[PDB]
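Limitations
The structure tokens in this dataset are predictions for the assembled complex, not deposited experimental models. Users should treat interface geometry with appropriate caution, especially where small molecules or nucleic acid strands are included. An illustrative entry is reproduced here so readers can see what is and is not provided.
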Amino acid sequence: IVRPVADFSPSLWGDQFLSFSIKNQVAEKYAKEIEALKEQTRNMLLATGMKLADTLNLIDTIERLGISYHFEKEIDDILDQIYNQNSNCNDLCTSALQFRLLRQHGFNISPEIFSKFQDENGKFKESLASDVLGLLNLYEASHVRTHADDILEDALAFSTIHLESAAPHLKSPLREQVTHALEQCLHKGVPRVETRFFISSIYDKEQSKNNVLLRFAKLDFNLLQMLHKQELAQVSRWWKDLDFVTTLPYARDRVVECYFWALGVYFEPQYSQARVMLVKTISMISIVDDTFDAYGTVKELEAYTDAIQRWDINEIDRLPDYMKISYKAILDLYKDYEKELSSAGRSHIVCHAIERMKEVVRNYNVESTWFIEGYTPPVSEYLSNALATTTYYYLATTSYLGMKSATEQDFEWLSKNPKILEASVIICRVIDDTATYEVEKSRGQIATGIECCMRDYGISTKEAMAKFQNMAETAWKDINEGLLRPTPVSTEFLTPILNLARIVEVTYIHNLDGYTHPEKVLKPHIINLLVDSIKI
Ligand SMILES: [Mg+2]
Ligand SMILES: [Mg+2]
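Predicted assembly:
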């Protein structure tokens, strides 16, 4: 059997993450100071007699600085007061911020707050074109709409063209903030990534900055980074002791990138165990993907798929030696999860992730059959298979394993493919397809998303990529709707799904496969989050 030639890049990190020794002296000092700063900041929030605009800017700044996870109760109480009092008597920048903050937190504030900023025709008054802070906040708000917000249909175009016009002549750091916003809006960005930029590039350089908030944000970010580095070291050692880098040379060596994914899903300390479980799953399923995509024969893939369905170590002998390596590693991993969850009596929930993995592999095999037969399915049939092969139903289910408060009813809800999960999956599917279209087309993949779309509807590549763009936009509106109260499960279990959608946007920014080619997109993010501390 002549296998295809290896074409992937090696890990660009080597062993620089393998050993990290925390400095307990520094960490304990940081934490001791943070406690003091945390309380000063709390008192800023609970301060009475604040104006609406000041209150919203405080909350907004604390969220962008990445320290709002300390104040979820206080921020919620305040936004709930604002929601229920109905203040319709403000300028564009306060109104747009009010809208965004409330919607992001699930409060269904009416989009009619914007009608006073539009003419009889529902288009924004062009007299607002000289209000840069108004335009910036309108811009950020435009990314949070649902299907019920067509009054905002013009907001993105309007704010974008006038921010571009104004940008070159703005003072710093406002100019940099506007320029950054036009490249990456806040709502669709990975939170740690946006936080790092905000602290270091914007707030640190604001003439008006609050010194207590800035120091708090820097210390907290650097302290959490220490934890992230310990987790990455622990995960790097686990990966090294599996040694797929040499026993399975056909596969992408990307455990750091996988960690960045898990860090994107949640960054907070209480999700430390959840992050480590998640990244191990991402790494492992990525090995299975490459086995199907760039190494295994049709016959070998069949045995592998069936062994996975039966899920039994007795089945290894049906497999070629190299497949025994991945298969035992997979079964062992899930036995590890089971033991790791035994202490809390949550072992039984592991079977939910296992059934989602079986689903991914069945659909991998189908995709392989299609490729060999040269089948180009209709879009409907294509998606019925290719949605699961994003792995996103599987990763979402996996993200719950290490979350201490996840109950069986939470898994029961997820298992029904609720709309917010379906939307996140769809976003990953159509963006990946738009980006990897050309590459897969050159490798003989006639069953690629865009191709199925072109053939089905009888339309050009351009028209099909536009249709996929529309599906992404529709899905973002569904994600935004799915955050609105009353939520079907706790918000804590929605945020990982939202964050998975965000990781897509960030990873495939400017239409490139950032996981396969980490050097362009992911490398600076990894350095900013996991190598370089913010200088105080
Ligand atoms: Mg694949
Ligand atoms: Mg693709």
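Some entries come with short summary sentences. For this one: The chain has two domains: 5-48+209-535, 49-208.
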